[PDB]
A paper describes a structure:
Pro‐apoptotic (or executioner) proteins such as BAK and BAX activate apoptosis through pore formation in the mitochondrial membrane; anti‐apoptotic proteins including BCL‐2, MCL‐1 and BCL‐xL, sequester pro‐apoptotic members to prevent cell death; and a group of regulatory proteins which bind to other BCL‐2 members (including BIM, BID, BAD, NOXA and PUMA), mediate initiation of apoptosis. In all cases binding between BCL‐2 family members occurs through the BH3 homology domain of one protein, which forms an α‐helix upon binding and docks into a complementary cleft on its partner. We have used phage display to isolate Affimer reagents (non‐antibody‐binding proteins based on a conserved scaffold) to identify ligands for MCL‐1, BCL‐xL, BCL‐2, BAK and BAX, then used multiple biophysical characterisation methods to probe the interactions. Co‐crystal structures reveal an unprecedented mode of molecular recognition; where a BH3 helix is normally bound, flexible loops from the Affimer dock into the BH3 binding cleft.
Similarly, the Affimers selected for MCL‐1 binding were shown to act as low μM inhibitors of their target interaction (MCL‐1‐AF1 IC50=2.1±0.2 μM; MCL‐1‐AF11 IC50=3.2±0.4 μM) but did not inhibit BCL‐xL /BAK,, demonstrating selectivity. Similarly, when comparing the structures of MCL‐1 bound to peptide versus Affimer we observe that the variable loops of the Affimer are inserted into the BH3 binding groove and that a desirable conformation is selected. In this case, the region where the protein conformation is affected is remote from the BH3 cleft, but again reflects a small molecule bound conformation. When BIM BH3 is bound, MCL‐1 adopts a nonhelical conformation at the QRN motif around Arg222. By contrast, when bound to Mule BH3 or a range of small molecules, the QRN motif is helical. Critically, when the QRN motif is helical, then ubiquitin can be added at this motif, and this promotes cellular degradation by the proteasome. Interestingly, our structure shows that MCL‐1‐AF11 also selects the desired helical, ubiquitylatable, conformation, again demonstrating that an Affimer can be isolated that selects a specific desired conformation. The helical QRN motif can be ubiquitylated; BH3 ligands that promote this conformation offer both orthosteric inhibition of BH3 binding and degradation by the proteasome to potentiate the removal of MCL‐1 function in cells. The Affimer again selects a conformation of a target protein to promote a desired functional outcome.
Numbering used by the authors:
A (entry chain D): 172 to 192, 205 to 254, 258 to 320
B (entry chain B): 172 to 194, 204 to 322
C (entry chain A): 172 to 193, 204 to 322
D (entry chain C): 176 to 192, 209 to 232, 259 to 320
E (entry chain G), H (entry chain H): 4 to 91
F (entry chain E): 3 to 91
G (entry chain F): 2 to 91
Amino acid sequence: SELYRQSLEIISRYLREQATGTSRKALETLRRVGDGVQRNHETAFQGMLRKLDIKNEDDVKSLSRVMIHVFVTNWGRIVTLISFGAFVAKHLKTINQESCIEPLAESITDVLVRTKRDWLVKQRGWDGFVEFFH
Amino acid sequence: SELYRQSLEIISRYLREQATGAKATSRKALETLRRVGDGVQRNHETAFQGMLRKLDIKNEDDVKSLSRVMIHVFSDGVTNWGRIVTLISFGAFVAKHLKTINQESCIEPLAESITDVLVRTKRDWLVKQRGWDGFVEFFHVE
Amino acid sequence: SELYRQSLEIISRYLREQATGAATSRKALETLRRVGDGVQRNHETAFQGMLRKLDIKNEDDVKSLSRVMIHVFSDGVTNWGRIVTLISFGAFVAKHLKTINQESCIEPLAESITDVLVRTKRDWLVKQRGWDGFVEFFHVE
Amino acid sequence: RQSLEIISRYLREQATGALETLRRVGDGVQRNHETAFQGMLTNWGRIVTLISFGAFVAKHLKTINQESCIEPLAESITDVLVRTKRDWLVKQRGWDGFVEFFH
Amino acid sequence: SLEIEELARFAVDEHNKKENALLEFVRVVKAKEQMGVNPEEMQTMYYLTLEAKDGGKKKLYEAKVWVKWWWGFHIWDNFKELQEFKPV
Amino acid sequence: NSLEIEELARFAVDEHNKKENALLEFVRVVKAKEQMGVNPEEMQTMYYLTLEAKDGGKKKLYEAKVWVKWWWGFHIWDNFKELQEFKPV
Amino acid sequence: ENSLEIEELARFAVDEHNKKENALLEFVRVVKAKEQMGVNPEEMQTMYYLTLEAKDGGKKKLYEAKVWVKWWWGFHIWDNFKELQEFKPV
Amino acid sequence: SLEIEELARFAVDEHNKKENALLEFVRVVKAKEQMGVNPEEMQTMYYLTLEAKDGGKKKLYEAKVWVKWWWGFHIWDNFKELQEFKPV
């Protein structure tokens, strides 16, 4: 969909620049909130990641199964999911699995647009995300 | 007062053994606290870590300061034994941190400051709950 | 104090118009008309049971009743649901006082409820931004 | 069987103008559920409230000249009770528990 | 204390019923509660001292009222029983 | 759930009949949707009901939105129920 | 949903048993799940009755676990205490 | 005061990260909250006057901190952002 194209664009772009170091407003919004959410969820994300063996793309595809199962809907919970993505992306970089980063972004985008599409249409998509954190 | 002597004995022994590691109304209250506080500390581990990283506990003035802002949480007008055991569990989490950074001499004052603000603020509620008997009953299995 | 004058205006007007037939103060009263009417319906039996076992013969009994009404908050829980229940009981008692030709006890009842509520819960009321807190609690998502 | 006689006898004397336990608790429960029971046309407290509701219907059946339905109403209420709380009615030692609840 | 005022009123009404007396309840002067052997019982024994007008003269009485609570279908129910009511 | 849903439907018909001066008779619930509170403090549910009712001896369908606000009362959960909308569909 | 929280309580029951009895059971799956909720609105507790399958040295056995959950109104959230009451072979 | 003390500390931490400075947070001397148009927003603007040490000298600063609250998965979560930080 039109939303999916921007979604994967935004989520992939954000997970990339995080791994290294409307769509324009969503990205800036994501830059603002994401690092704050990772910092406070540091011990949370660590604990969750520690109980999830991710040494390959098999585990990345298996991570989306529990991500799409574990999924109240608000931009807070959405930015937390994408933020957890950035945290796993950084991890994948430290263990020489950089090639699993674009697929991780796709898995997260898949889960977001699948389970909560009704809500995003209702929200005016990423224009709404920018408003929630405005 | 009886309520004060009991409250201080329970909260001091709990914070001491939590900071350390190892081991009727007063006895049963401490056994209850050991069951529950360990579970409450695990559930709140992340939130407690968050608060601690943003607070100074460098002297007894900071310990007294912390006790005052810890009791201020009841101002929404709700008091129950769950909220009370969370406060003590935070106390125990702060005690472990005080042992970790070689400030063991702040532990008993923290225990004393928490007892003070709890008994001073919530004496009437505590007596009406039959003191620490109400606490034991609240976490007794149906 | 403004909290007092607001609380008296709201509780007086609601008890009076409940006993008869028919800005922030305007909205608190709007909220009370929505909610009090449903709280009275729901508690009708309980309120009738209480009333049958209490004396409300004079202003001393009205004063005494306001005191035992507020005592309910001693389990350590205060919210706008419990407060609207207290006021709704007030309205129920006001209708009964009209029924037994004691209409002159209705305004004193409103005053005594107001007095005991503001005296006992001033700090909690202020922290809720007063009656704006009440309007918000019963504002539909 | 032993239930049915208690319920039947309690609903009978009620309609006119354990038994001793129901006498004590029943009229109290009817008084303060009068309105809930008017429109209706686990613990011993809820159980005495069902039998209490039996007595209220029994009183109603008398006012509307349908007294011949009172004994069937006792059997009806007794059956639905024992069939539904068979595993629960044995946990409170039968009516020896009912009496303890209100002792 | 609302509950205490209701129990004392019940005490007089119930005493008035069982012994063809016309006592008029005035006030509670002192209330004591001895609560259940264990909390799960939810039974409370009330010792009440109350003022009542007996033929226009104000006498005092010791009422003992047993209350047993239980969870009703959407409300708390109870059973109250006057055990003793004697002048003092 | 369903039993409580039927009573809210009856409640919606009763409130409609009172607020609009009408004599609809509740027949049955067709479908029931619930929006729960966005956070644990809100303690409110929005019920979206489609129901069948008789109007002058002909059955019609109606959409009713019934708001429920709850709170800790005196030893019980207490609530306020309010009809937000009632229109034919 | 229900199935997820019940699964987490079962994992909890195994984790708590493994600590309390110095055992190394591996949770496999929830088999049966019943719950008795509080008799009144003030109790605010649930008792969870689980049957679960765990591996004990690479052989799959069944267990009965009783997990107690006491909840209360915390600071702007519902909060709870979970406790393993019973854990026996079936 | 608990959320206020953590917000002032965060303001000092956030300021001196954004402006490459080494202020030591000492205390909040005054706290004002400008809460959002409607409470459904759940966004609060905190105005804080705070003491911080700069080159081991005690100075005072006005900090504006925006806080958007939302219901997280098992916890109340928020996004804090320093909007302004200047000496007074």
